[PDB]
Every structure is written in C-alpha cells, then in structure tokens.
Design a protein around this ligand. Structure first.
Ligand SMILES: *[C@@H]1O[C@H](CO[C@@H]2O[C@@H](C)[C@@H](O)[C@@H](O)[C@@H]2O)[C@@H](O[C@@H]2O[C@H](CO)[C@@H](O[C@@H]3O[C@H](CO)[C@@H](O)[C@H](O)[C@@H]3O)[C@H](O)[C@H]2NC(C)=O)[C@H](O)[C@H]1NC(C)=O
Ligand SMILES: CCCC[C@H](N[C@@H](CCc1ccccc1)C(=O)O)C(=O)N[C@@H](Cc1ccc(O)cc1)C(=O)O
Ligand SMILES: *[C@@H]1O[C@H](CO[C@@H]2O[C@@H](C)[C@@H](O)[C@@H](O)[C@@H]2O)[C@@H](O)[C@H](O)[C@H]1NC(C)=O
Ligand SMILES: *[C@@H]1O[C@H](CO)[C@@H](O)[C@H](O)[C@H]1NC(C)=O
Ligand SMILES: [Cl-]
Ligand SMILES: [Mg+2]
Ligand SMILES: [Zn+2]
Length: 611
C-alpha cells in the first residue's frame, strides 16, 4: 500500500476518530477512483488485459480496506458505538467492516478472479444457431426475441439457449464464490453473507416485514396472472397453456418473466383507445439514445434538480459499440468517487421500456450528484432501495398519458374509465408482475448463503421459488446441471436484489408524497410532477442526505411514515385491482396454479425447425 494511502496514528477516542475519517476520505477517494476506473475500462471493453488490471485494482482496494479496517478496530473497537457524532459512528462502522479484505491474500486473489470470470461468462455468453457461426447476444438479440416474437418455438430456443449458455458454466464458480464470501463476512461477525446484506436495512424484523408486505400484494399478482394466462391461452392454445397451471416462463415478454409490459398488446382491455405503448412513435419520429437521455435530463431540471455534467456526456457509453468490442451491456450508473466523473453505461435501444430504464439510471446519477460532497462512506442511499426508487418515481409521471402528450409521444388525449383501465393494466404488467420476482431472488440467495440450499439443490430450490411466487414453469426440462439462477445478471455480478422489492413499494410512497407536495388533487395514477419545484425540493432533501441518517427517519420526513407501506401502491392500482377481480370471476378463472407439476410439451420439430 502506497505510504500516502496508509493510516497514520490517531488517538483512541472520538476526536481521533474524526481526524481518522478525514484522512481516510482523502485516500479512499483515490483508491475508489482507480478501482471504479479499472472496472469501467473492463466493462466497456472486455479483454483479458483489462480484467487483469481490474483484479489488481481490486487487490489494492482490499489492501487499503484491511489497513484502515484493522486500524479502526485497533483504536476504536470499544468506543465507536458510543460516539456523539452519529455520522461518525456510521463512517467508522463502515470502515471496520472488512468483507473480502478479511481473506488471506491467496483467497483474495481467488475471490477477485471468480468475480471477474463470472462477470465475463455472463456478459459474453452467446446463443448459436444450428449456421454454427451465427450467434445471438443477450442484448439486443435475445432481448428482442423475448419481447417481440410470438413464436412459441423461437421463444423457447432463445430462453433455453440463454439459460444453458450463461448458467451451466457459472455453477462451479458460484459455489466457490459463495464459500469464500461467507468465509470473509463470518470474520466481520455475520453468520453468512446474506445476514450482512440484510443488515443494511437495520431492522430486526426485516424478513417478517417483507413477508407481511407480500401478503398484501399477492392477491393483485394472482389476479393479474390469471387474466394474462387467459390471454395467452387464447393465442397459444390448450396444448401450451394450462388454465389451472403455471405459465411457461418464456411467454411473458422478458427473459426472466420479471416484467410483462412487452405483451401489453396481447392483453390490452380496450384496444380502440389510445395506444399507450409509444415505441412505434419513438421509432417513427427518429428517437435515438441521446434524445432519450436529454428528455430524461430535462425532467430532472424541470424539478430544479441538477443537469448531467459535461463529464457525463463526454464519458458515458449510451449505445452498444459498433466496433464489435465486447462490453457489459447491462445498464448501470457509475460514481467514480472523485466528485467529477459520473457516467451511465447502457446499450440503449429505442423503446418505451428503455426510456424507463434511462430514467432509472439517471435517478442513480442524480443521487450521486446530490451527495457528492458527503464523506465517501455516506455516498449511498438511505438504504439501497431508496437508490433504486428515485428514477422510477419520475418515470411514473413520465408514463402518464398526459405527460406523453406533452412530449409529443401521444397525440390523442382521453380521460375516461376505459383509458384508465388500459393505463393501469399496462402499469400493472410492469410493476405488479415484478413483485414476486423482486421478492424471490434473494430468498434463493439467502438460502444459498445460509447453507439451506447446497449446490445439489441450486436449481431445484430456484424453480421451487419461481413456481411458488411467480407461478411459472420452465418450458423445457431442467436438472441440477442447469443453474438457471446464474442466467440472471445480479447473481454472477453479486448484486443484491431485495432492494428492488423494497423500491417497488417505496416508489409509490414517494410518488404519493411528491404529488401531494406538488399540489396535485386528482387520482394518484394521473399525477405528473413535471415542473413542480416544490416536489423537486422535497426529493432533493432525500438525495442530499445520502446514508448520513437512518432511512426510517428520512422516510418519515418525506412521506410522514417511518416504515414501508403497501397502501400507496394499492391506492394507485385500486381501479384495475377491482376490474381484474371482476373479470376473472366473470370468466370463471381459477386463481393460482393448482396443477403445480404441469410443464408444457416440446414443440413438434423442435429445435430442428428453428431455421
Ligand atoms: C380525469 O377526470 C377525473 C374525474 O373528473 C371528475 O369526474 C368527471 C366524471 C367529471 O365530473 C369531472 O368534472 C370531475 O372533476 C379527474 O379527477 C378529479 O379531479 C378533480 C380536480 O382536480 C378533483 O376535484 C378536486 O377535489 C379536491 C378534494 O379531493 C378539492 O380540494 C378540489 O377543489 C377539487 O374539487 C376530483 O376529486 C378528482 N376525482 C377523483 C375521483 O379523484 C382527473 O383530474 C382528470 N384527469 C385529467 C388528466 O384530466
Ligand atoms: C430499469 C433498470 C434496469 C437495469 C438495472 N441495472 C442495475 C445495475 C446494478 C449494478 C450494480 C453493481 C454493478 C453493476 C450493476 C441497476 O441500475 O439497478 C437492473 O438490473 N434492474 C433490475 C430490477 C428493476 C426492474 C425494473 C425497474 O424499473 C427497476 C429495477 C432488473 O432489471 O432486473
Ligand atoms: C440434464 O439435462 C441435460 C439436457 O437434457 C434435458 O433432459 C432431457 C431428458 C430433455 O428433457 C431436455 O429437454 C433437457 O434439457 C442432459 O444432457 C443431462 O444429462 C442432464 N444431467 C444429468 C446430471 O442427468
Ligand atoms: C480495449 O482494451 C485494450 C487493452 O486490452 C486497449 O488496447 C484498447 O485501446 C481498448 N479499446 C478501446 C476502444 O478503448
Ligand atoms: Cl439490497
Ligand atoms: Mg417493450
Ligand atoms: Zn438501479
């Protein structure tokens, strides 16, 4: 570790901890920047040499973390919990958590290599056609197939091809990662890595609180599921759709069946009302990636939040490179921890759902811009779910028919009950369909980290959860050679997921509060906070707090409640919740999937007829 980056000496008291945190911040920003920059160079240009440099940067970060972590525990282990300065407690508490820096050097190198290799496998996996040369990438190729194809056999080829190509090679690496991760965090005092991940929410009742939320939300999902299953039955037939069983997992518009907005055209209750999927208009009008990011930016500035700085436009990767070089296409927003460089890396496609993704990612950037002057350790969301909700909340306003009209994406304006059902159904396909998936992913991973799910049951327990919560089934047979959890980005890239369940609840609490602050006095689902500087100032207070204060208190200040609450989501959706319940009763639907063992047959002449 460079001498200038090494911890000096400080008193064993709070006043020494304060000087300790300032000296830490100085060197931490440099160590973080080199690490983030190395990751950027790799993720925008996947090569063996760039992976080598990223692993070296990661090792330097662990060296820094160990030196300052062990100094913090040498001086302040018994006194940090009683500091008068609450923010200093939070800084010290972070510095003393060593994580992977607890591993001996050889195991640190093994850990870093596993992360690099798992990331490379996921982001370079291809589905090749039997033209053995011609191969499809996840983004854009397979994504577009899952979204736009209505051929059962083609969707099956993409789904199976992807899950086999990405998942199978990941499994042995993921087992080794799990063990090393647990070994590291057990030395921080946690029973397993999942216990450390859950500790970020600082709630002893976290898992019970989540379960109580899901109980309130499940009836909405069950009714949406049944309605969509009926629509799929009308298209695909009784051979491929069981009206009393799970839905085949490749028919819902998305590789993970996690959002169903891409099948809206098949389920739209009132098709002679305005077409709320504006993708065709974006195409017809010549929208490009840069337009989408500028439109998102202008929403933020309309609230008197910050525009994207020049460094963002100069540094960001907003389209998949055409030079063919391999990149991580999965969208992400980057803080370089130097208070200057902030970037998005997105293989942007011109679609309405991608416009939502742009807002999501710009939400992350806006957070970074607002807390850039806090101590580096507090440059975080109040909890990780706050960070995920910011851009989604703005996108709730952007997607309203009234707002789409303002930005020239929807000429026809209507305010009637049928148009409301259409819109709320489209929003339910995006938001309510996700809830079971957002809930289940880390239930699977918590079980893996705790040892309840050993490698011999990775796929068994994955599909148990997928059927239990989402009510879907794999469209081809799977066994424990398959590792279908690994075919979802966040698993090999070791990104926790419960934040997204939290953020899908929170964003409606936020929306309700901002709409009220904006002076809006109509239905919650028609609110548009565009150009509300009052709403912007309330949101700005959250963003500037970072993780300096307990999230329960930040939430109370914003929305008047100190807890996650499903009521605002329920209130947003109430008209379509009622409508879907009535429609399923009239149609005699069975809610749920009592034929839990059912799987669709293979197409005749599959995969042979894929050409
Ligand atoms: C779409 O239309 C709805 C419904 O509009 C209402 O019902 C129609 C059948 C007609 O009779 C309309 O004349 C009638 O307004 C609109 O929602 C409604 O908005 C109004 C105005 O913001 C709300 O009235 C306000 O109520 C608050 C108290 O809640 C008072 O303080 C205000 O002074 C004002 O009277 C009304 O409550 C609201 N209705 C519901 C059920 O929420 C909606 O604004 C409109 N949307 C668009 C984009 O035009
Ligand atoms: C719309 C955003 C899609 C892209 C997003 N990308 C991650 C990168 C996280 C990351 C962390 C550390 C290193 C690298 C990446 C991020 O921005 O959170 C993502 O995955 N969202 C979830 C979940 C989700 C789905 C719909 C939403 O409206 C919001 C969230 C999903 O699509 O499954
Ligand atoms: C796991 O499955 C692999 C792929 O074949 C699968 O099972 C057959 C019966 C078909 O249903 C097919 O659609 C499935 O994808 C096998 O090659 C492999 O041997 C199996 N692994 C073990 C350990 O048995
Ligand atoms: C990709 O990385 C290599 C080093 O592995 C470098 O020589 C090359 O210039 C990079 N390409 C781009 C476009 O940055
Ligand atoms: Cl999280
Ligand atoms: Mg779409
Ligand atoms: Zn995010």
């Amino acid at each position: 570790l460079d001498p200038g980056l090494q911890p000096g000496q400080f008193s064993a008291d709070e006043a020494g901890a304060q000087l300790f945190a300032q000296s830490y911040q100085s060197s931490a920003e440099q160590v973080l920047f080199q690490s983030v920059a190395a990751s950027w160079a790799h993720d925008t240009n996947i090569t063996a040499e760039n992976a080598r440099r990223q692993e070296e940067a990661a090792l330097l970060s662990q060296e820094f973390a160990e030196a300052w972590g062990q100094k913090a525990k040498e001086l302040y282990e018994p006194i940090w919990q009683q500091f008068t300065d609450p923010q200093l407690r939070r800084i010290i508490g972070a510095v003393r958590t060593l994580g992977s820096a607890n591993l001996p050097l050889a195991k640190r190198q093994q850990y870093n290599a596993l992360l690099s290799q798992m990331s490379r496998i996921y982001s370079t996996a291809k589905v090749c056609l039997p033209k053995t040369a011609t191969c499809w990438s996840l983004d854009p190729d397979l994504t577009n197939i899952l979204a736009s194809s209505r051929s059962y056999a083609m969707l099956l080829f993409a789904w199976e091809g992807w899950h086999n190509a990405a998942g199978i090679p990941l499994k042995p690496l993921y087992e080794d990662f799990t063990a090393l991760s647990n070994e590291a965090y057990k030395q921080d005092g946690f029973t397993d890595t999942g216990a450390y991940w859950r500790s970020w929410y600082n709630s002893p009742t976290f898992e019970d609180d989540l379960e109580h939320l899901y109980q309130q939300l499940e009836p909405l999902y069950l009714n949406l599921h049944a309605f969509v299953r009926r629509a799929l039955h009308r298209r695909y037939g009784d051979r491929y759709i069981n009206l009393r069983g799970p839905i085949p997992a490749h028919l819902l518009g998305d590789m993970w069946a996690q959002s169903w907005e891409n099948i809206y055209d098949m389920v739209v209750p009132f098709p002679d009302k305005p077409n709320l999927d504006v993708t065709s208009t974006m195409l017809q009008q010549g929208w490009q990636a840069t337009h989408m990011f500028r439109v998102a930016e202008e929403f933020f500035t309309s609230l008197e939040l910050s525009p994207m700085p020049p460094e963002f436009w100069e540094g960001s990767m907003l389209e998949k490179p055409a030079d063919g070089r391999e990149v991580v296409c999965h969208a992400s927003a980057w803080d370089f921890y130097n208070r200057k460089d902030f970037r998005i890396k997105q293989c942007t496609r011109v679609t309405m759902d991608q416009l939502s993704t742009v807002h999501h990612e710009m939400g992350h950037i806006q957070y970074y811009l607002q807390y850039k002057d806090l101590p580096v350790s507090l440059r975080r969301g109040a909890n990780p779910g706050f960070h995920e909700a910011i851009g989604d909340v703005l996108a709730l306003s952007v997607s309203t028919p009234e707002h789409l009209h303002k930005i020239g994406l929807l000429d026809r304006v209507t305010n009637d009950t049928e148009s409301d059902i259409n819109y709320l159904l489209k929003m339910a396909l995006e938001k309510i369909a996700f809830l079971p998936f957002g809930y289940l992913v880390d239930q699977w991973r918590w079980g893996v980290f705790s040892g309840r799910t050993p490698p011999s049951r990775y796929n068994f327990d994955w599909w148990y959860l997928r059927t239990k919560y989402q009510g879907i089934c794999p469209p081809v047979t799977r066994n424990e050679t398959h590792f279908d959890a690994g075919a979802k980005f966040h698993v090999p890239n070791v990104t926790p997921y419960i934040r997204y369940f939290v953020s899908f609840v929170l964003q409606f609490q936020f929306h309700e509060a901002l709409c009220k602050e904006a002076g809006y006095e109509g239905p919650l689902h028609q609110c548009d906070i565009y150009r509300s500087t009052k709403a912007g100032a309330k949101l700005r207070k959250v963003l500037r707090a970072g993780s300096s204060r307990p999230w329960q208190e930040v939430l109370k200040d914003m929305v008047g409640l100190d807890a996650l609450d499903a009521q605002p989501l329920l209130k947003y959706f109430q008209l379509v919740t009622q409508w879907l319940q009535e429609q399923n009763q009239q149609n005699g639907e069975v809610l749920g999937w009592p034929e839990y063992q059912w799987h669709p047959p293979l197409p005749d002449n599959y995969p042979e007829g894929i050409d």
